[PDB]
Amino acid sequence: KPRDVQVLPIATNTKVLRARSWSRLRFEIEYALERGTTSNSYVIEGDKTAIIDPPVESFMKIYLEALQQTVNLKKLDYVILGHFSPNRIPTFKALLELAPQITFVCSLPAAGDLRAAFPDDNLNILPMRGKETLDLGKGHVLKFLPIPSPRWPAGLCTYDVQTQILYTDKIFGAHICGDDVFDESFKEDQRYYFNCLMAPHAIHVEAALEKISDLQVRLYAVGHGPLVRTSLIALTQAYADWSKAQKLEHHH
Numbered sequence: 001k002p003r004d005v006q007v008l009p010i011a012t013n014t015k016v017l018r019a020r021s022w023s024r025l026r027f028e029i030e031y032a033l034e035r036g037t038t039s040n041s042y043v044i045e046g047d048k049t050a051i052i053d054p055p056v057e058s059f060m061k062i063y064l065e066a067l068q069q070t071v072n073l074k075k076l077d078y079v080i081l082g083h084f085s086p087n088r089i090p091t092f093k094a095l096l097e098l099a100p101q102i103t104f105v106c107s108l109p110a111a112g113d114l115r116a117a118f119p120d121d122n123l124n125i126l127p128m129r130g131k132e133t134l135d136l137g138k139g140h141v142l143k144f145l146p147i148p149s150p151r152w153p154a155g156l157c158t159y160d161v162q163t164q165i166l167y168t169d170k171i172f173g174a175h176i177c178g179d180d181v182f183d184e185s186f187k188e189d190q191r192y193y194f195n196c197l198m199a200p201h202a203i204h205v206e207a208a209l210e211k212i213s214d215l216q217v218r219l220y221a222v223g224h225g226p227l228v229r230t231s232l233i234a235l236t237q238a239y240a241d242w243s244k245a246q247k248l249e250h251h252h
């Protein structure tokens with residue numbers, strides 16, 4: 001099948017765009033189960049509009065086409081980044097051209113990287129250190145929880161108090177492409193994902209879990225795979241169990 005974008009309302013004023021691929025994006029171990037992947041981006045429309053996590057260059061064209069069909073790019077206020085990677089730069093560059101008014105919202109360690117990627121541009125950047133919130137209006141107050149780790153110094157979770165959705169980007173996902181938007185049995189895929197991408201940073205995973213533990217969450221709006229709804233509590237417990245196990249191995 002060809003790559004496409006799946007768009008669906010998920011909450012009040014909230015939609016997901018899942019850019020889908022039935023084959024690996026890279027020749028790397030995280031795709032080695034050969035089940036494809038999705039890259040998930042989100043749109044919250046309050047008084048102000050924010051997008052969360054625009055995908056890599058590979059999905060850029062179909063992403064922007066779908067986004068243009070969903071929102072008026074001249075009405076776009078914020079682009080929130082769950083982390084920073086150079087393979088997203090071309091997507092940011094296209095967004096900037098189409099919506100020159102946008103403000104980038106990121107964890108502090110990403111701010112420098114952004115400005116360097118657009119050196120002869122004057123970027124609007126709003127770094128979030130964890131104290132300040134961002135009000136989109138209509139109740140959509142965003143809380144920011146930086147989860148810096150050696151792998152993702154600018155790792156950031158975002159929580160919408162109105163919908164109780166936590167945007168977790170790399171945390172809690174799975175590399176699997178299917179028709180189902182929401183999470184059942186891709187437990188194997190979530191576990192493999194943890195082992196590929198989370199396990200080497202187990203003490204930081206634990207720190208992240210502690211940070212989010214006081215939140216009332218109805219959905220993990222993850223960066224890859226099905227959105228974690230009903231399996232949220234069980235997956236969170238699994239991440240905790242898998243993390244303490246890894247710590248045993250790490251020591252030897």
Ligand SMILES: [Cl-]
Nearest residue numbers: 083084152154
């Ligand atoms: Cl990062």
